[PDB]
């Protein structure tokens, strides 16, 4: 049957490894609340205002489900077994279910608050698979599904940036009159999630969404030598190296030495020239990707308009800590506390350099662009990396490697939006008061991962991700990584290697 | 299944444009409350009483759904695309659904009030499609469905005017004894919505109503020249113009000039003679349509009896601001704040004039009536105009052009009435106390619009409704029209052109 | 007599849709980010590690290629373009040099903001048109995939990158063609070629 | 919201006595050419596309 | 029939807009003349010669039909309606006829 008192679905979880496939099931307990008091609002996002960096977003009542990260779908055991036993993997299919909803009313008299289940209140649930609305998810957000299946998942409000602010700044001047600047405002899109059709669910009801990926593989195999050493040092070469006269030393023609042969392959692109700017408040990235159409007025300049492009060095060796990719394990993390810095995976298609020689010596080429015969490996993703990124809709685009490592998909998984159906309340005024409710429920993401097992003719052992690669933590510091403190706290990895990255273990003949 | 805890219907919205059809879906969250404490009452509606203008209405417990306006069904995007891409449109069919009802009890102890869902309380829902009861809807009411899909829709009480008051005034005198005046009262109809059969719905239940229009088109195409210039100025004419003797100048017979040929067509009717009267309180319109059967007594006279006919000038040029059609975007709007004045659409079948020449010169004809060979275009409706108007049931009627622009239908969409089923309460007295409840729910109007795309042999570009035709508003005044203030306020159009009227863009060869 | 010729195209679309925000703002400013921004020591100010601010998130996307470095040369008579694409095989003799051999590549800035009027695409409506008479200059279409810029920051401030080449993760829109633009262009027959965007907007 | 559209209001007068619009014929018979890039009605202006 | 005095084809023009397709028809009156006196020639193209920029072209007797521009195929009305109502467009097929020679 169906109704109040009949659970809609059960709990699923775990993982089933096969040769061709890996099916990772997860279920979480989520809570969403009334956002903005059921209003759309466009307000300026202001920093400390030491610099003129500002932002403008339109905040909706809606909240959304973000499934994008590997930490959500794989346990540390499932990840270790994934990266040790398989050379490559990608997400075949994804299935999300939202069930066992409970909408409860919040009754607050004074300090103490009580919770009464109304049973007739619904929730709006909307999945955008055509990407007609602006994307909610962005890589490296803290909104993502929790790692531990028993933690509650608190959803985040949905908002989006209608316009670039400094372009719309209205600052202008008396001479220009900012006509082209108003023109940007006049066409500033405004999206309501109410335009589209969507489901309204009460406690007895549930819903389901399926997604089918088609995307590129994530390669777990390591390069033991650079592509430049793909030769045989015993065999002589036919080539000639002519060196022009340098100072006193005369020009010399001679056969290239057998041990160093010319490479036909060049360094993967990346930019080492730029450096970060300014205080932590302003956007600090070394490069700023910005748009400045003629006629508009920008008073602040620099990073005020534009968004920073980081990490700038895609394949290149991160000479400085600024270039190394870095994040925090926990939202409580402050500077140097709980931060993880990317380290070399010791893959020779990764952390490349290029030296421009003059007559006397070699010097580092700061920034190298796309050039033919460039081969490189994508960032060695860990378990904490985002799975996908949304590729913009644009006429032309170059090769897609996001330097964070995420996969650029032009149709990533749809973003599932959910909110409290507004329950109005009678009021003699215009005060448009509403009833205070929230909904908790059980969401289950189940993804089918397409894996393919390695095979090698290598004689020797290979590196593997081992639990011996972990450190103790917690109070009294006897709890390992990925384990629970006596207080109940979950011990986060303190190093990039405890995150078990790919492109480390398995060797691949170049 | 069905019951408490199973939502009856989901949310629908958006629009699907085709060549033949446009289907605009909308869903709103409505709230209706107990009205008149479940009583019918006939009370006098009294103004400041500076003038003897009075009204008498019988107020019901019922509230009703008013779907009549374009703003409800079309977004500003859907409207722009409608009026730019299509020469004419009309409403094929309409489908209204009322579902996801929630009837909650209002418990008030002192100041703080609580809301408990009873689940056994029903609501009465009645659709009058035969128009046996007096029509609730009237054009240009504020009771209409809201523009923004996320705003709550508060329904209005249903009432109607049983009699014309000054006819029933009882004032009379000692000499007349007002016998014919009592005769009007003796037959004064009294309508109860309980006479008819109607549905009672609880939370699990829903209802649905379908309507099929048959009505006239709304033409979006513009006249570039007046019908008087439909000639060819190069070709000579055969006609003669004889001018009688004027003063000294002798009577002259001569061929009419090629460049000015006689027109067979005349100005569309309209009345410029009258002017508005009195204070804002009394009915101010320039013409008063009234009924004054013999023997009745009218002490106040003038606009006391009768209803004002405005705008008086149907097709004629609105010489003064009094004649221009004007309204407010928001019910908070006071004088000159938030008011929109109709402006010329620059259609040459619109804003006509007629000059009566004497011998010496031409003079404006104040009021022109129906006369043969009159051609004109209906008011250039905007997005804020009512869709339809109810044509009275009468033996004879002339051509139907409402000067507000609305379509006169003799069977418009039925008015859907809804009220709280009275839940009595035991009381030892006669005090007939009742239980205090309200109902909120989701109503969805879905209309199928019949559209037909233009085609033209014109070489040049044509005017189109553009977002560049908008102005900034809100606090700090950086928010465009049709967009949301940082406080969440929705920015209303400040001009008639921001309302995107019809009969502007597309040209039509006369 | 008469004659008839039929042709069947197969080619890329011409996209009429506008980008309202840059791809860099594709994030959500309310949601915090997990990423860290480490700033090396600058002068007195010590090196600071801290979470990236929610309102400015890192973009994975970069500016479409274009060249702002070069400037036009010489009188109107000679080929004036800022860059000269030329061929100079060994052993041949070139007395004049510069733009004598080679054809000018203009507009040089494909997606980049046309800092100067030299870079803006420009033409005449009528063959009778002389200088400043009847000339039409391309203006911003206010598409945020168009008229991009890229700033290279040092420690203290940001500076404009003059010329940017093909680099991964570059997204841009083709020139906003008008009604007076050519429809197509003939792609040369060559072994290798990069992505085809003619900066005049025509289809190759 | 509404979106920008190419409108004839985006045109200028020309010709002799300057009462002829763009894309129209001068009393001499001359065809009035657009004087600005916006009168040429470019693409990638009107319609919005979610990135 | 066919011959002198029987026009080979009529005038076509206009545009028919649909959802999937747009068919723009055009017809023009062209004039071509004897070029180079029926000779091929390779001559230097010389500027004012203030700089050493020079060009060499071989000029034929032939003349040619250039259909490449949007202004030709779309009227300002057809273009406005194209760019307002459609997100993308490309040329499926093209048909050229040359008739009514004199």
Three-state secondary structure along A237-256? CCCEEEECCECCECCEEEEC
| Residue B61 near residue B35 (C-beta atoms within 8 A) | yes
> Contact E83/D23, CB-based, under 8 Å?
no
Q: What angle do CA B60, B64, B67 make, to 5 degrees?
A: 150
Burial E25-56 (b: 16+ CB within 10 A, else e): eeeeeeeeeeeeeeeeeeeeeeeeeebebeee
Q: How many residues does chain E have?
A: 102
Query: Cβ–Cβ contacts within 10 Å for residue A301, how many?
Result: 15
For chains C and E, what is the number of CB pairs under 8 angstroms? 98
Cross-strand partners of C203: C184
Q: Rounded to the nearest 5°, which phi and psi values hold at B110?
A: 65, -140
Contact residues on chain C for E56, CB-CB shorter than 8 A: none
The experimental method, as deposited, was cryo-EM
Contact residues on chain E for C8, CB-CB shorter than 8 A: 92-94
Q: What is the separation, in whole angstroms, between the first and last Cα of chain C?
A: 35
Taking alpha carbons only, the member of A284, A311, A288, A310 closest to residue A298 is A288
> Contact C141/D49, CB-based, under 8 Å?
no
Q: Is chain B in touch with chain C: ≥3 Cβ pairs within 8 A?
A: no
Contacts of B249 (CB under 8 A, 6+ apart): none
Task: Report CA A457 to chain centroid distance, whole Å.
Answer: 35
> Contact D41/E80, CB-based, under 8 Å?
yes
Query: Cβ–Cβ contacts within 10 Å for residue A296, how many?
Result: 26
* Residue position matching structure tokens 């009592």: B182
Q: How many residues does chain C have?
A: 204
Q: Could you check whether the bond before residue A428 is cis, i.e. omega within 30 degrees of 0?
A: no
Q: What is the experimental resolution, given in Å to one decimal place?
A: 2.7
| Residue A473 near residue A484 (C-beta atoms within 8 A) | no
Nearest CB among D43, D47, D48 relative to C176 is that of: D43
**What six digits make up the tokens of B117?**
């869902």
3-state helix/strand/coil string of chain C: CCEEEEEECCCCCEECEEECCCHHHCCCCCCCECEEEEECCECCECCEEEECCCCCCCECCECCCEECCCCCCCCCCCCCCCEEECCCCCCCCCCCCCCCCCEEECCCCCCECCCCCCCCCEEECCCCCCCCCCEEECCCCCCCCCCEEEEEECCCCEEECCEECCCCCEEECCCCCCCCCCCECCCCCCCCCCCCCCCCCCEC
Is A391 buried (19+), middle (13-18) or exposed (0-12) by CB count in 10 A?
buried
The Cα–Cα gap between B301 and B288 comes to 11
| Residue C155 near residue A275 (C-beta atoms within 8 A) | yes
Question: Can you list the pairs that B246-254 forms with residues at least 24 positions away whose Cβ atoms lie under 8 Å?
Answer: B246/B359, B246/B360, B247/B359
| Residue C118 near residue C76 (C-beta atoms within 8 A) | no
| Residue B101 near residue B202 (C-beta atoms within 8 A) | yes
DSSP class of residue B38? T
Cross-strand partners of A127: A416
Contacts of B291 (CB under 8 A, 6+ apart): B164, B167, B305, B306
> Contact D2/B500, CB-based, under 8 Å?
yes
Taking alpha carbons only, the member of A155, D1, A164, A81 closest to residue B465 is D1
* Residue position matching structure tokens 């072994």: C191
Nearest CB among B79, B461, B480 relative to D11 is that of: B461
> Contact D44/C173, CB-based, under 8 Å?
yes
By a Cβ cutoff of 8 Å, what residues of chain E touch chain D? 76, 79-80, 83-84, 87
**B: neighbours with 3+ CB pairs under 8 Å?**
A, D, E
Nearest CB among A135, A183, A393 relative to D49 is that of: A393
Q: For testing the chain A interface, which of D4, D9, D50, D51 should be mutated: the one with the most A CBs within 10 Å?
A: D50
By a Cβ cutoff of 8 Å, what residues of chain D touch chain A? 1-4, 48-51
Task: Report CA C144 to chain centroid distance, whole Å.
Answer: 13
Taking alpha carbons only, the member of B132, B133, B127 closest to residue B198 is B127
> Contact A163/C114, CB-based, under 8 Å?
no
> Contact B457/E85, CB-based, under 8 Å?
no
Calculate the alpha carbon distances from B433 to B83, B418, B428 in Å: 53, 21, 10
Contacts of A509 (CB under 8 A, 6+ apart): none
Nearest CB among E9, E52, E87 relative to C100 is that of: E52
Contact residues on chain B for E77, CB-CB shorter than 8 A: 456, 458-462
The strand ranges marked E within B151-261 are 152-154, 156-160, 199-201, 207-212, 218-219, 221-223, 240-243, 252-255
**C: neighbours with 3+ CB pairs under 8 Å?**
A, D, E
Q: For testing the chain E interface, which of C4, C13, C14 should be mutated: the one with the most E CBs within 10 Å?
A: C14
Q: Is B144 helix (H, G, I), strand (E, B) or coil?
A: strand
> Contact B1/A4, CB-based, under 8 Å?
no
Calculate the alpha carbon distances from B453 to A106, A290, B22, B25, D44 in Å: 53, 41, 11, 21, 24
Strand B326-328 vs strand B307-309: parallel, antiparallel, or unpaired?
A: unpaired
**What six digits make up the tokens of B64?**
């009703």
The Cα–Cα gap between B396 and A203 comes to 58
Is the Cα torsion angle E73, E76, E77, E83 positive or negative in sign?
Answer: positive
Q: Could you check whether the bond before residue C107 is cis, i.e. omega within 30 degrees of 0?
A: yes
Contact residues on chain C for E54, CB-CB shorter than 8 A: 100
Nearest CB among B459, B464, B481 relative to D7 is that of: B464
Calculate the alpha carbon distances from B393 to B388, B404, B408 in Å: 16, 20, 11
* Residue position matching structure tokens 């959304």: A64
Contact residues on chain B for E75, CB-CB shorter than 8 A: 459
Q: What angle do CA B231, B236, B238 make, to 5 degrees?
A: 95
| Residue C175 near residue A317 (C-beta atoms within 8 A) | no
| Residue C142 near residue C162 (C-beta atoms within 8 A) | no
| Residue A93 near residue A447 (C-beta atoms within 8 A) | yes
**What six digits make up the tokens of B298?**
């009218």
> Contact E98/C182, CB-based, under 8 Å?
no
């Amino acid at each position: 049957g169906s109704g109040v008192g009949i659970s809609t679905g059960g709990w699923v979880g775990g993982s089933h490894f096969s040769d061709k496939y890996v099916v990772t099931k997860n279920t979480r307990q989520f809570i969403t609340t009334i956002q903005n008091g059921h209003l759309y609002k466009t307000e300026a996002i202001e920093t400390t205002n030491q610099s003129g960096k500002s932002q403008r977003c339109v905040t909706t009542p809606w909240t959304y489900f973000n499934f994008n990260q590997y930490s959500c779908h794989f346990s540390p055991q499932d990840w270790q077994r994934l990266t040790n036993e398989y050379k490559r993997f990608r997400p075949k299919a994804m299935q999300v279910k939202i069930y066992n909803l409970q909408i409860k009313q919040i009754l607050s008299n004074g300090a103490d608050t009580t919770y009464n289940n109304d049973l007739t209140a619904g929730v709006h649930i909307f999945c955008d698979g055509e990407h007609a609305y602006p994307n909610a998810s962005h890589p490296w957000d803290e909104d993502v599904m929790p790692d531990l299946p028993y933690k509650t998942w608190k959803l985040f409000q949905y908002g989006y940036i209608p316009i670039e602010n400094e372009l719309a700044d209205l600052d202008g001047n008396a001479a220009g009159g900012n006509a082209t600047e108003k023109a940007l405002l006049y066409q500033m899109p405004f999206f309501l999630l109410e335009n589209s059709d969507h489901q309204v669910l009460r406690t007895g009801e549930s819903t389901e969404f399926t997604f089918n990926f088609d995307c590129e593989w994530v390669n777990n195999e390591r390069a033991y030598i650079p592509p430049g050493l793909m030769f045989n040092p015993k065999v002589p070469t036919r080539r000639v190296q002519y060196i022009r006269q340098n100072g006193s030393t005369a020009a010399s023609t001679g056969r290239i030495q057998p041990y160093s042969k010319p490479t036909s392959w060049m360094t993967g692109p990346g930019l080492l020239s730029a450096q970060r700017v300014g205080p932590q408040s302003s956007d600090t990235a070394p490069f700023m990707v910005c748009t400045n159409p003629e006629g508009t007025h920008i008073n602040t300049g620099a990073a005020g308009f534009g968004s920073g492009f980081d990490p700038p060095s895609g394949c290149l060796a991160p000479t400085n800590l600024e270039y190394k990719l870095q994040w925090y394990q926990t939202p409580e993390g402050t500077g140097n506390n709980g931060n993880i810095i990317a380290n070399p995976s010791l893959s020779m298609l990764r952390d490349q350099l290029l030296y421009k020689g003059n007559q006397t010596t070699y010097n580092l080429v700061g920034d190298i662009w796309m050039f033919p015969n460039q081969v490189w490996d994508r960032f060695p993703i860990t378990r904490e990396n985002p799975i996908w990124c949304k590729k913009p809709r644009a006429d032309k685009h170059t090769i897609m490697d996001p330097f964070d490592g995420s996969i650029a998909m032009d149709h990533p998984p749809g973003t599932i939006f959910i909110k409290m159906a507004k329950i109005p309340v009678p009021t003699a005024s215009n005060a448009d008061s509403y009833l205070n409710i929230y909904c908790t429920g059980q969401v289950s993401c189940e993804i089918v991962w397409e894996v393919e097992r390695y095979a090698t003719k290598n004689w020797r052992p290979e590196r593997r991700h081992t639990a011996l690669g972990m450190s103790l933590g917690g109070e009294s510091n006897y709890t390992p990584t990925y384990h629970v403190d006596p207080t109940g706290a979950y011990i986060q990895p303190t190093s990039y290697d405890q995150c078990m990255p790919v492109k480390t273990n398995i060797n691949k003949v170049l």
